[PDB]
Amino acid sequence: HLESTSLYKKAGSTPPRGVTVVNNFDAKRYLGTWYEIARFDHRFERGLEKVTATYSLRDDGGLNVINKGYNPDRGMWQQSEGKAYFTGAPTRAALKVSFFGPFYGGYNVIALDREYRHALVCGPDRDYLWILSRTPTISDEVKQEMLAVATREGFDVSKFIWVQQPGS
């Protein structure tokens, strides 16, 4: 049901002790739009609701990232653009991603269903975690499964902000 993962470490890009990263990734199936179901309180997303990330393939082998979100304190939709690159083999879902301005950090897919509908992604340490989905809501069952992996990999899931989405 879930993609295979294995313990993976790269200095400066993965959390202490390593995390189980997807090891038979197919980047083409990760393209397009994902909704941010949940995030930890990442400084560079603070305040934002209805967040999405949209990935597209670049000529240089990286991905373009378009981040979109609504700031309820301003009543305005916002957008930013980043880049993503594999740090190693493209079958390992370990990348570096520009999360703000020119500053790149680790982006590690630590759970992924085999149909590329739902994903658990962590950053370079345990202050950075996302649940992503092809739909604006997920089932309680999918929520439990993603949370279970996060807990297994040492994250405190009570740090999640459950992001406002259509139908949420």
CA neighbor of 150 nearest in space, from 134, 131, 137: 131
Question: Toward its own copies, which CB reaches closer, 113 or 127?
Answer: 127
Please give the residues from 23 up to 82 whose contact with its own copies meets the rule CB under 8 A.
42-44, 60-62
Partner touching 55 among ligand VCA, its own copies, none, CB below 5 to 8 Å by kind:
none
Least distance CB 82 / ligand VCA (angstroms): 7
**Residues 118, 110: contact at Cβ < 8 Å?**
no
In sequence order, which residues have a C-beta less than 8 Å from that of residue 139 and are 6 or more positions away?
A: none
Supply φ then ψ for residue 111, to 5 degrees.
-150, 145
Question: Toward its own copies, which CB reaches closer, 35 or 128?
Answer: 128
Partner touching 67 among its own copies, ligand VCA, none, CB below 5 to 8 Å by kind:
ligand VCA
Indicate the burial class of 21 (C-beta count within 10 angstroms; 0-12, 13-18, 19 or more): buried
In sequence order, which residues have a C-beta less than 8 Å from that of residue 17 and are 6 or more positions away?
A: 9, 154
Partner touching 143 among its own copies, ligand VCA, none, CB below 5 to 8 Å by kind:
none
CA neighbor of 161 nearest in space, from 118, 130, 122: 130
Question: Toward ligand VCA, which CB reaches closer, 42 or 117?
Answer: 42
Q: Which residues pair with 99 in a beta bridge?
A: none
Please give the residues from 141 up to 160 whose contact with its own copies meets the rule CB under 8 A.
none
Question: Toward ligand VCA, which CB reaches closer, 62 or 106?
Answer: 106
Least distance CB 43 / its own copies (angstroms): 5
Least distance CB 137 / its own copies (angstroms): 27
DSSP string for residues in 12-24:
TTS-TT-EEEESS
Residues near its own copies (CB under 8 A) are 11-12, 16-17, 42-44, 60-62, 83, 85, 96, 98-106, 123-125, 127-128
